[PDB]
Amino acid sequence: TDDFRVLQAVEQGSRSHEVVPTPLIHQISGMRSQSGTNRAISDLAKLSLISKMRNVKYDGYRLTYNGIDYLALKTMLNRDTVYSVGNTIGVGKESDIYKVSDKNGNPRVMKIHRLQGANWMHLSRLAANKEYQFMSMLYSKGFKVPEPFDNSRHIVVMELIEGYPMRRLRKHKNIPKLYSDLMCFIVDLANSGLIHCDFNEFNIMIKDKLEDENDCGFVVIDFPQCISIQHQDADYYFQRDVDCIRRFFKKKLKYEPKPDSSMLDTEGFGD
Amino acid sequence: TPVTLAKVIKVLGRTGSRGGVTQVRVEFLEDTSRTIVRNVKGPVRENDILVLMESEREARRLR
Amino acid sequence: LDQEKYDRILKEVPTYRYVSVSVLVDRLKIGGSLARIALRHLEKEGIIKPISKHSKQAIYTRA
Amino acid sequence: SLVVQEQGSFQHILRLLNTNVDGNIKIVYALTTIKGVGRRYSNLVCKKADVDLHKRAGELTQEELERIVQIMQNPTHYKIPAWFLNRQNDITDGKDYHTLANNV
Amino acid sequence: QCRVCSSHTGLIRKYGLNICRQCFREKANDIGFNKFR
RNA sequence: CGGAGCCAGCGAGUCUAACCUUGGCCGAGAGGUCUUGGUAAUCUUGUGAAACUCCGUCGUGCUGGGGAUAGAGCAUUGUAAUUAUUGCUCUUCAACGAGGAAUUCCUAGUAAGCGCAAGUCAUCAGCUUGCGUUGAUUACGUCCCUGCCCUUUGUACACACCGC
């Protein structure tokens, strides 16, 4: 409790100034002697959790990406989250995705964000908060999407979903209803006011419950591509979504549309 | 279709954000008395001939 | 099916000013293999006139 | 060559060795359709049967199909030696087999 | 296998001279392959 | 795919050993036999490489594109090849209908395509390096992104008040 509290205090000793000198980490902690502060900073620096910037007549301490997530783990110790860390499935551009587990033993997904001194951390924070709010907007509207657990300042911990992408999915039996689904869902996107331009094969994720009841769903992860309908180029974005669905269903599922697909002028009488 | 015939007389330098477009001073070919300032994408030496469409359009600067 | 594919070659080749390998498969009666046999056969008859000959494409002319 | 035209008389899809064969490809690449038989195998069989392989499989008489089947059940008697067959020097019998299409 | 000074790291195994790239540039001024271009 | 034409260069090669091999016969081949030449601008070597040129078969059809996977045997080096070292023959013929978010390199014989030679080499490359054959498009401008610096100096609030 206590060491994590003092590490939270020097976390709160970051939102005061720029690159923090040694005596501010001495005094913001407010600890007893030279021992705790100096040996803690040395434990940080040897684990690369802190770095020394010595700009003339001026010692200072430079926090890298390492010595933050513990506090996030402490922030997630508060919010009942992950206990065990590490299984690499997917190293993305603006996040690194890991498979983790709680005290309860259910596996979850840990997207750490790495987008120094304040701005790498803070822009990872803005990215995590923005994606968490977009996930909140999608789940509040009712879109079938993974359920968010938390957004530990810059690391998003969410659920794991049993799905595999459509590139390894040959076909299903109810192909025209799947086409009506992947038309009406982009219709629902235009009724939300947004167009997800990367509506590709690798986006769409299908969970598979049974083979008799047919009670399943979908997962759509296109977050840095959703564009409002008011922008300059949304017409052929919508048409690229529709036509990628149609060209995939012609190439893979060998299905041509008997009803005509919706245009942007069709969906202008929507939202 | 009005095919405007043009003459490069004076290059002004390299403009554009990427540093690709060229501001070109133009002697209009059919009528000598028109001197236009145009924007050309591509390699142009002195006393070359251009094919514009509008003699009346002039753009100040680019970014 | 011999007398209702073959003579349409003899109607169409004098019609078409240009007769080559794939402007004679295009009639959608024949394959691309036997088309060149019909080409050489019309060379021998004389309705097809040789312009130039290559092992992948051969240019001819009606008579 | 000479356009040799036939008033019908060809069948669209033949059936041989209990397997459907398309009577429109070359006879090598129409007998390649069945299992246990590839390109060079059908080629050498129809050369031992002296079949004109620039002729399609619709212009092929059933007597040559009988010749091809006779080379199927007798490859080693018609001067096609042991290197060319599927199962050479077996363990069950010690012989050379060419395992056919539906007999696998 | 280094048969000179037990220096397997970076043998130059070509032609059986078998000197490591550390000691090959020690003894580079004894053979004659030197810096021209 | 089936024939034909057959164009280079950098290398490299054996002793107190089995290196590079020409040629001749046998074998469908893998390979084997018998020798011969070269310690090298001499023999391998004119390394008759590949891509390329021409003519026929194919006819747009996951096709005669693809060759992954698997079966059968036969040979080669290695003491030992099994989780197959590898080479040869026939058969089995899968995903893959020009590819997303994003990513790399580059201005003339350069890119790109191609093979060859040398080191890894007891056997094989999809490993690395040099060589030669065919040979584009398009800039020859920019700091707009990416950064990298180089500086100019508004300055330290020279550490101030607070609410907290």
Curated annotation (Swiss-Prot), chain A:
Keyword Flavoprotein assigned: no
Keyword Membrane among record annotations: no
GO cellular-component term (any): cytoplasmic stress granule
Catalytic activity of the protein: L-seryl-[protein] + ATP = O-phospho-L-seryl-[protein] + ADP + H(+); L-threonyl-[protein] + ATP = O-phospho-L-threonyl-[protein] + ADP + H(+)
Domain annotation Protein kinase: ranges: 83-226
Names of the cofactor(s): Mg(2+)
Variant or mutagenesis effect after changing residue 155 to V: In RIO2-1; nuclear export of ribosomal 40S subunits impaired
Impact reported for residue 61 to H: In RIO2-1; nuclear export of ribosomal 40S subunits impaired
Gene Ontology biological process terms from the UniProt entry: maturation of SSU-rRNA; maturation of SSU-rRNA from tricistronic rRNA transcript (SSU-rRNA, 5.8S rRNA, LSU-rRNA); positive regulation of RNA import into nucleus
Post-translational modification: Autophosphorylated.
Protein's cellular compartments: Cytoplasm; Nucleus
One GO MF term: ATP binding
Active site: 198
The protein's Enzyme Commission number: 2.7.11.1
Residues that hold ATP according to the record: 111
Coiled coil: none
Effect of residue 198 to A: Decrease in activity
UniProt keywords, alphabetically: ATP-binding, Cytoplasm, Kinase, Magnesium, Metal-binding, Nucleotide-binding, Nucleus, Phosphoprotein, Ribosome biogenesis, Serine/threonine-protein kinase, Transferase
Family: Belongs to the protein kinase superfamily. RIO-type Ser/Thr kinase family.
Protein purpose: Required for the final endonucleolytic cleavage of 20S pre-rRNA at site D in the cytoplasm, converting it into the mature 18S rRNA. Involved in normal export of the pre-40S particles from the nucleus to the cytoplasm. No longer associates with pre-40S subunits in RPS19 disruptions, suggesting it acts after the ribosomal protein in 18S rRNA maturation.
Note: Present with 10300 molecules/cell in log phase SD medium.
Protein name according to UniProt: Serine/threonine-protein kinase RIO2
From Swiss-Prot, chain C:
One biological process term in Gene Ontology: cytoplasmic translation
Keywords attached to this entry: Cytoplasm, Methylation, Ribonucleoprotein, Ribosomal protein
Full-protein residues shown: 42 to 104 of 108
GO molecular function: structural constituent of ribosome
UniProt name for this protein: Small ribosomal subunit protein eS25A
Compartment(s): Cytoplasm
Superkingdom, natural source: Eukaryota
Residues annotated as signal peptide: none
Record's miscellaneous remark: It is presumed that the precursor part of S25 is engaged in assembling of the small subunit, thus being essential in ribosome maturation.
TM spans (from-to): none
Function noted in UniProt: Component of the ribosome, a large ribonucleoprotein complex responsible for the synthesis of proteins in the cell. The small ribosomal subunit (SSU) binds messenger RNAs (mRNAs) and translates the encoded message by selecting cognate aminoacyl-transfer RNA (tRNA) molecules. The large subunit (LSU) contains the ribosomal catalytic site termed the peptidyl transferase center (PTC), which catalyzes the formation of peptide bonds, thereby polymerizing the amino acids delivered by tRNAs into a polypeptide chain.
GO cellular component terms, semicolon-separated: cytosol; cytosolic small ribosomal subunit
Quaternary data: Component of the small ribosomal subunit (SSU). Mature yeast ribosomes consist of a small (40S) and a large (60S) subunit. The 40S small subunit contains 1 molecule of ribosomal RNA (18S rRNA) and 33 different proteins (encoded by 57 genes). The large 60S subunit contains 3 rRNA molecules (25S, 5.8S and 5S rRNA) and 46 different proteins (encoded by 81 genes).
From Swiss-Prot, chain D:
GO biological process, one term: endonucleolytic cleavage in ITS1 to separate SSU-rRNA from 5.8S rRNA and LSU-rRNA from tricistronic rRNA transcript (SSU-rRNA, 5.8S rRNA, LSU-rRNA)
Molecular-function GO terms, alphabetical: rRNA binding; structural constituent of ribosome
One GO location term (cellular component): cytosol
Post-translational modification: N-terminally acetylated by acetyltransferase NatA.
Keyword Cytoplasm part of the UniProt annotation: yes
Positions where N-acetylserine occurs in the chain: 1
Record's keyword terms, sorted: Acetylation, Cytoplasm, Isopeptide bond, Methylation, Ribonucleoprotein, Ribosomal protein, RNA-binding, rRNA-binding, Ubl conjugation
Crosslink site: Glycyl lysine isopeptide (Lys-Gly) (interchain with G-Cter in ubiquitin): 35, 48, 79, 95
N6-methyllysine modification, residue list: 47
Top-rank taxon, per record: Eukaryota
Location in the cell: Cytoplasm
Task performed by this protein: Component of the ribosome, a large ribonucleoprotein complex responsible for the synthesis of proteins in the cell. The small ribosomal subunit (SSU) binds messenger RNAs (mRNAs) and translates the encoded message by selecting cognate aminoacyl-transfer RNA (tRNA) molecules. The large subunit (LSU) contains the ribosomal catalytic site termed the peptidyl transferase center (PTC), which catalyzes the formation of peptide bonds, thereby polymerizing the amino acids delivered by tRNAs into a polypeptide chain.
Extra remark: Present with 48100 molecules/cell in log phase SD medium.
Family classification: Belongs to the universal ribosomal protein uS13 family.
Protein name: Small ribosomal subunit protein uS13A
Organism whose genome encodes this protein: Saccharomyces cerevisiae (strain ATCC 204508 / S288c) (Baker's yeast)
From Swiss-Prot, chain E:
Keyword NADP: no
Cellular localisation: Cytoplasm
Principal location class: cytoplasm
Stretches that traverse the bilayer: none
Domain of life, source organism: Eukaryota
Family statement drawn from the similarity comment of this UniProt entry: Belongs to the universal ribosomal protein uS14 family.
Name of the protein in question: Small ribosomal subunit protein uS14A
Covered range of the whole protein: 20 to 56 of 56
